Structure formats: C-alpha cells, structure tokens
Amino acid sequence: PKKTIYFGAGWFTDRQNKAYKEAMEALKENPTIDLENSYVPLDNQYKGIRVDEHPEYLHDKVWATATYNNDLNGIKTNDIMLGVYIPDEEDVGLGMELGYALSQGKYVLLVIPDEDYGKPINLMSWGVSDNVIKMSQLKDFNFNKPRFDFYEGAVY
Amino acid sequence: PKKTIYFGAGWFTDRQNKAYKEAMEALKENPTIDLENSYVPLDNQYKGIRVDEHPEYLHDKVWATATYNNDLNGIKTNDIMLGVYIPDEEDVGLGMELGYALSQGKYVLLVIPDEDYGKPINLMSWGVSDNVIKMSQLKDFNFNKPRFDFYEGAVY
Amino acid sequence: PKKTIYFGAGWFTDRQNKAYKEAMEALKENPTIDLENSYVPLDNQYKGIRVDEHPEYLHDKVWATATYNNDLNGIKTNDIMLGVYIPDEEDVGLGMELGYALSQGKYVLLVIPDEDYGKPINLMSWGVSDNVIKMSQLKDFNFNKPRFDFYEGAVY
Amino acid sequence: PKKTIYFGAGWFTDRQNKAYKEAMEALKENPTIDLENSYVPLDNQYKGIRVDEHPEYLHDKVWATATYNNDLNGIKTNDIMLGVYIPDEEDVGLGMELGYALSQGKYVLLVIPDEDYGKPINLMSWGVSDNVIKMSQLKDFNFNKPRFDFYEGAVY
Amino acid sequence: PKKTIYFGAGWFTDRQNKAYKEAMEALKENPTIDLENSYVPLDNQYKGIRVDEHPEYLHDKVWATATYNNDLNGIKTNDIMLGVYIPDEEDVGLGMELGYALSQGKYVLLVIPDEDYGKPINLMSWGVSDNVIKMSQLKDFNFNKPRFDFYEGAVY
Amino acid sequence: PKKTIYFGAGWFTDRQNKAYKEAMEALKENPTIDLENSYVPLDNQYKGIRVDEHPEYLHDKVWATATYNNDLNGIKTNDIMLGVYIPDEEDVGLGMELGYALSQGKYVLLVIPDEDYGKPINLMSWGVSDNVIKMSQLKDFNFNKPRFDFYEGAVY
C-alpha cells in the first residue's frame, strides 16, 4: 500500500532549497509514497497568489487566513508529516506544523541532509519527532511500517 | 482571579535574552498573573542542569526525555501559553510549543518587543496565535478576559 | 470556588431571546458562577458590530473569521459550556459548539425553558450533553460539583 | 484511491429528503468515493429499530445510547465528514456532528443545493467547514485532494 | 490555590482498599487539595447504587452507561488524575483512566503504598505517568507546582 | 480494502498466550486485515532487547522510553485497536492502550475467548470498547464496516 505525506519544508535559504530538491527526488523513487495525492505547500498557495512574487497579500488577512487553513488541512488529511530539517537553519513555521502534526496523531518524520546529520537540533524538535533519518535513507524508508527511534545527534 | 502561564521564550541570543528579562518583569507587575505557580523552562531542566553549562548532557537521551516531558507538562497544566517572539530570530522550539498549546485548548499569546512590533512574522505563527501584543502592554494585559485579535503587522 | 461559562444561546427569535434573558438572570443569582469573567458571544463580535445592525458585514470574510475564532476561544478558555436550548427551535450554531466543547473536555450543560421541558430533543444533542435542566434550576445549580445525568424527556 | 464518507444528512423535511436523494446519486457517480464501505445513518439505526416507524424507542435510553455511539463511530472511522446542508432548514443534529468531525481531524465538506447556494448560513457552520460546494459540483469533487475554501455566500 | 482531583483507586481487594483508605486520609491533610469538590467514583455511581450491593445491576446497560459517563466526566472536569497503584494488583479500569486523563491534558500522578514502592510496574503505566510517589509523600505533595519525574523502580 | 491493527495482547499467563495464538490465526484468515503492515508489540521491542530474556533493561530508562513510544506509535499509525481480552486476567497495560486508542479516534475492538464470553469485565473496559465479539467471530468480522455494540456479558 501507499501512504501520503505533508511536505513540510522551507524555501527561504539556498540550503533549504537544496534539501527541498533532494527530498522530492527521494520521495519520487519511494515505492510506498503516493506523491501525487500528497500535499506540498508551494503547489497549494491560496489561488496561486504567493506573496514573495506579488507581495500586496502580505497584509491581506483573507489570503493569510486561507493559506494557513489550507496548510493545516493538508496536514490532517494526509498520513505522514514529513519535515525537511536543516539544523543550522531551523524554521519556526515547520515547528508549529510539527506540534500540530502531533495533535493530529500523525507519524512525524524528520529528514536531515547527510552533511548536517549529527548537528544539535532544538530539544522540542527532538522530542516531538517519531524518528529522524538521514536524507539518503529517505528513498528506501518504508512508510508502511513507521517506527520510533531517537535522533543520534545532539540537542541544545 | 489569577492565571498561571507557561513562559515560552528562547534564551539563545542577546536580543532573545533581553526580551526574556523584559517580559519577566512585566509579568511580576501584572495583577492577573500568578507567577509564583507558573512554569518557567530554565527553572525546570532535568536535574537542574543546563546543557550549555554541562555539555556532557548533549547526547543524554534521558535528560532530553525528562526535560521535554517536563515542558509539555508545563504547557498542559498551566492556563496561558505565553510566547516571547523575535520576528527576525524565530525559535523553532517555540513554534512547536505553539502547536501543542493549541492542541491543549490553551490561549496562545505572543509578546513582541516594542521596537520589533510591526515586523512581519511567520504565517504559521500568525495563525495559531489568539492575540499578539507589544512588550509594553504585557504589564497590564487582563488575562482573566482573554480575547482574540489579529496582529497589526504582516506575515511572510 | 466559582466557575466561568461560555454562554451558548441563540438570539434569532422571540422565544430564544426570552430564554436568553431568563438564563442571564438566573446566572447573575448563581453563587457558583463568575459571570463578570464569562464569555458572552453578543458582547464579543468582531469590532463590536452585530451583522443584523450592519448588514454590510454579511460577506465580510475577516469579520466572520475573527468572530468565529473569538467564540471558539471563549469555549476553550472557560469552564462550563452552557447551552440555552429550545426543542422546537434548535440552533445549528449551538449544535457545533456542543461538539467543540465536547472536544475540549468541557462539561456540557443544557438549560431548557420550564414550559418546554419534557419535549423531545435531537438525538445528538441528548448524546453530547452531560446533563440537562429546567430554566428554574439554573439559579441554584452547583457548578463546583458538575455531575452527569439523562434528560427526562425523549429524543427524535 | 478512494476515500469513505459519513453521510451527514437530515430526513425530516421534504427539501432535506430531496437533497438526500441528489446527494447519493452524485456520490455514486464519484470515482474517488467508496460508497459501499461508507456510513449512512439510516442504513445503520440500532438493529433496524428507528423510532419514527415503531416509536416506543423514543424513550428507550439504551436505543438512544446505541444509535448515538454508532453515529459517532461512523464519523471517526470514515475519512470525510459530508454534510448535506440546507440554509433554510439547518439541523442542530448535523451541527454537532460537524464539531465532532473537527475534533476527529476530518475534512468537513458541506454540500448546498444549487438553488440555495448563496443563502446565509449559520456562522459556526461557516467557520467549521473546510469547504462548501454546490450540489452539482459533488459528483466531480476529487476527495483525494481535499482543499480549503470559503463559502462565497453570506453568514448571519 | 487548591487543586481538585479525580480519585482513581480500585476497591476490589483488601490491599487495594487499605491503600484506598490511606490515600483518602493523606489528601484530607494536603493543604493544596480541595477534596470537598473532588470526584470520588464510589460516591457517584448511578442512582447511588453499587453493583456489589445490588447484583441485579450487573447487566443493566443504562447503569453501566451513566456510571461510565459520570466517571469520564469526573476526570475531565477535575485538575489532577490521581491513581492509587498496587504493583502486583494492577487494575485495568485504572489503566484506561490513565490513558483518558492523558488525552485530557491532565497531570497523571501515581501513588504507591510505601511497602510496595520500588516493585516493578507495567511499562505502559510507567509511561503515561507524569510522576509516581510513595503513599507517605501524598500528605505534603505540592499540587500547585506539579513536575515530571521518573519512577525509581523498574518496569516489566 | 484492508485495515491494519495494533495487536493489543498480553503474554504473561498461559491463558493469555493461548488467546494470543488463536487471535493471530483468526487474523490470518481474515480477508479485510492487512496483518503484514500491522503492529504487534513482541515483533517490535526496542532493537530486539526484550527484558524477560535479557533483563538488565528493566531499569534502563532509555529502553523503557523507546519501547513505550514505539507502542503508542504503533496504535496511532494503525487503523484498529485490537485488544485480546481475558476477563479473569485483565491487563492494566492493555487498559491504558484502550484509553489512548480512544483519544486517537480509533475503533476499539475487544476479543474474548468463547469460553470466557459472558464473564464480568471491568466497567471502564466495557465503556471504552466500540464492540466486543467472541473469539470465533474474529476471522469473519468485517473490519471495513466497524459498528457499535454492547458487550452482552456483565460488568463489575
């Protein structure tokens, strides 16, 4: 069978975007992931109007309200909460989605790029996570048998 | 009546710590806050040990587990979720705590330093918050009649 | 001790409003109720504007969003969920609030006008309720020792 | 893939029943709906004994208890909460199921018959809903990619 | 301030009842506990009838339903979940109440008889608990500052 | 379609183990159960190190923490909470998992061996359960259409 995921990932820094690209590739090769019916924030911004390209909407309460809800809905309707984590550039946005994921009883999986694996991550991120793998493990990670496991890196 | 809070505020930078101190002072003055029974993270780390003071605990799974568990317990057993926020120094740990407090039916209140007030904040942070105020309002905020409200500034 | 409530009661009809007033009076007399800190919907509409008084807000998504959010916040931050009920004038808005209060671990208490007491109520309303009482008991109900009980009347 | 649904719909008024019939038809033609393994209240009344045809059970606490629980179970085990909504004849029953649906992290979809689309609906119904479509949109609505969207009608 | 509890403690054996009595006495002495408003199961059975005193209620679905509902209500409307625990006489009913109290954001506190303290307890019980103490500490435990902690003994 | 399950069952007593064996057999013959992708505690003990065969880990906080979380994760990621219940030898462990199952919105199914069916079970177990069948009914129980039903035995 196949499980769907919420692609929790930033797009602010270059490193964030580098991971984003590797993450999608890995997920495409994964046989237990139904990527088409999954939810990816970028591909689901309120009626195509994402602020960073046409910024009048940064102050638009309606746009913000819709985008926020669309995201929360994208987490609760999908099976796995996937968070592309970068130790040196942690995102408050992703953090909130992790805690929300917890409340929705979802398997919270964190993926750290191989180069950063080991670097101290925030304590709360360490505690909420159900497992923390290396980016290279992603493509073969079996989402049909999700299991608990401690991040073998450090906290701060 | 008086409300107890969970003091969510990072202590990882000079600005954060400045805000941390300021907020602590405002609360001691707030007639509607029982600070003596509130939960303050840095005063509840497992074994009373801070990892910055004792790096030998950086990979101690037991320390991480207890400290994490103690914190979730602080959020769930207290009335209000307080989040000292720095727009350009956003804490992923605080983000998670916002989502969890949300899951526990708590009133989420962000406090932004006066100087920083107005700066754009992460979309998800703007979403979970029930209200957001300046540091200089924290001293009088009536916690017995917590109401909802939008942030004046923008989101990114 | 004293308990705060979320005053769930429709104001869309003559009978509803009559019940609304009656209940408000009973609560002011109840020694176990802190009405001064309770949440009453009509006193917390966004911007202080009622849509019946200002129809220009009928399609205002921001007004709807804030008012809705303020209400959910009233339910979650208060002790008891009070529902003024009219068997043959059942409010769908109140129904939703019953399910949400249920989700928030709140004690759900329905108050039916003496005259209407005994009339059949919707199955789902009879289910979520923790107890249901006549309007004339509301004045003395001990909110400090909230117990469960079946409605004497029937369901439809 | 296919998602299952809880068919939340009344059967009290003629209009309610008219929508009920159109709703089922639409769902039969929908390729993303597994209608057979879904839950529909009528087809699941406690051991065939629905009150309106053999009414001694209106006062039977056991019958009411079983029917209520069977419904709540029908919502939590299925994927989508479908509510056939009629603006002029809103149902408190359906409302409670909507709020409960929320607590269970379910996608709440509302379907209003094309003739009524636009008519003001209760505020709480507007806020709980994840999306509100026209009856004619049902048959082609893709339940594999549920998304957020505001009801373009009015509130009250 | 003072905290109310839900008195979870089995009364099905000589030892259990001995612990039951002991704990009741410690609480009457505890300055931080409002026992007068706490919920004690045996004092809230439906109709005031114990099934051991009236076996004709052994298969009464209504009695079971009300009593069960009253208990869940006691857990959700009170502050602390207290669990009087006997390592070699573990109550499945108490186990369930631990998971539910956990679901309601309550502080779970196990009290083990001094003599029994140190004996291994079930893994799941050791997990949900926020803290576990000897019977002789219950008299002074500060319920206003509930903290997390591991059990000294083992698990099985 | 097929649903997955959390195999909640003890292995302490001979009778517990007798039921365990019959339970697995029944589940193998069941066409609506995807047994391979399900979760069974024994087959998932923290890195093969189960205490009862190499007991130094009874006092290992890390082992206990991991095993506990792995179990909770096994319940929330799977569809049905299956509890192999033995009236004469109830398990506190299983009870906690039942209440947790409730919080996760899972269908809670109890299976009592035919010889014991009818024997009084704990009240809390009776109330949390969504249905209670005889062991012989298991293999043909359709998990695609889970329904509510009262245990026809007694309580205590």
Tab-separated table of C-alpha atoms in Angstrom, chain C residues 72-146:
chain	number	residue	atom	x	y	z
C	72	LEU	CA	-14.030	29.020	19.852
C	73	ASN	CA	-11.643	30.854	22.145
C	74	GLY	CA	-14.468	31.612	24.555
C	75	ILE	CA	-15.397	27.928	24.728
C	76	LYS	CA	-11.831	26.702	25.260
C	77	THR	CA	-10.809	29.302	27.850
C	78	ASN	CA	-13.905	28.922	30.050
C	79	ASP	CA	-15.016	26.172	32.455
C	80	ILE	CA	-18.547	25.217	31.531
C	81	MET	CA	-20.336	25.057	28.203
C	82	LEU	CA	-23.840	26.388	28.752
C	83	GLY	CA	-26.436	25.817	26.068
C	84	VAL	CA	-29.815	27.537	26.265
C	85	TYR	CA	-31.993	25.095	24.322
C	86	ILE	CA	-35.414	25.404	22.623
C	87	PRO	CA	-36.611	21.906	21.496
C	88	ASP	CA	-38.711	23.216	18.604
C	89	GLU	CA	-36.254	25.978	17.629
C	90	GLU	CA	-32.910	24.166	17.644
C	91	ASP	CA	-29.861	26.236	16.644
C	92	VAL	CA	-27.271	24.570	14.359
C	93	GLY	CA	-24.670	27.024	15.659
C	94	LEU	CA	-25.249	25.752	19.190
C	95	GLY	CA	-25.019	22.195	17.918
C	96	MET	CA	-21.498	22.820	16.601
C	97	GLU	CA	-20.472	24.470	19.861
C	98	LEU	CA	-21.659	21.363	21.702
C	99	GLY	CA	-19.327	19.135	19.661
C	100	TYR	CA	-16.375	21.526	20.061
C	101	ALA	CA	-16.900	21.939	23.826
C	102	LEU	CA	-17.043	18.147	23.924
C	103	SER	CA	-13.698	18.090	22.142
C	104	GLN	CA	-12.252	20.490	24.731
C	105	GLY	CA	-13.100	18.365	27.767
C	106	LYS	CA	-15.769	20.788	28.935
C	107	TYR	CA	-18.854	19.990	30.969
C	108	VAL	CA	-21.809	20.454	28.617
C	109	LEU	CA	-24.974	21.704	30.315
C	110	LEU	CA	-28.254	22.327	28.508
C	111	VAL	CA	-30.917	24.541	30.017
C	112	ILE	CA	-34.435	24.192	28.653
C	113	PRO	CA	-37.251	26.665	29.464
C	114	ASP	CA	-39.580	25.180	32.097
C	115	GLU	CA	-42.549	25.255	29.704
C	116	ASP	CA	-40.573	23.410	27.047
C	117	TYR	CA	-39.003	20.909	29.467
C	118	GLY	CA	-40.003	17.356	28.600
C	119	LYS	CA	-40.346	17.930	24.842
C	120	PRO	CA	-38.217	15.641	22.648
C	121	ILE	CA	-34.762	16.907	21.673
C	122	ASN	CA	-32.452	15.901	18.826
C	123	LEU	CA	-30.611	12.588	19.426
C	124	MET	CA	-27.155	14.132	19.039
C	125	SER	CA	-27.995	16.925	21.485
C	126	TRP	CA	-29.208	14.352	24.025
C	127	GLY	CA	-25.934	12.491	23.475
C	128	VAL	CA	-23.223	15.182	23.926
C	129	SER	CA	-24.917	16.764	26.906
C	130	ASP	CA	-23.530	15.865	30.294
C	131	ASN	CA	-26.787	16.995	31.913
C	132	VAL	CA	-29.942	18.983	31.027
C	133	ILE	CA	-32.011	21.099	33.440
C	134	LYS	CA	-35.034	23.409	33.573
C	135	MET	CA	-34.530	27.164	33.462
C	136	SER	CA	-35.780	27.430	37.061
C	137	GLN	CA	-32.952	25.215	38.370
C	138	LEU	CA	-30.195	27.257	36.727
C	139	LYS	CA	-30.358	29.766	39.584
C	140	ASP	CA	-29.062	27.208	42.123
C	141	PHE	CA	-27.188	24.583	40.104
C	142	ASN	CA	-23.912	23.810	41.859
C	143	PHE	CA	-21.288	24.269	39.147
C	144	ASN	CA	-18.493	23.173	41.507
C	145	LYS	CA	-19.794	19.594	41.589
C	146	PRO	CA	-20.915	19.019	37.976
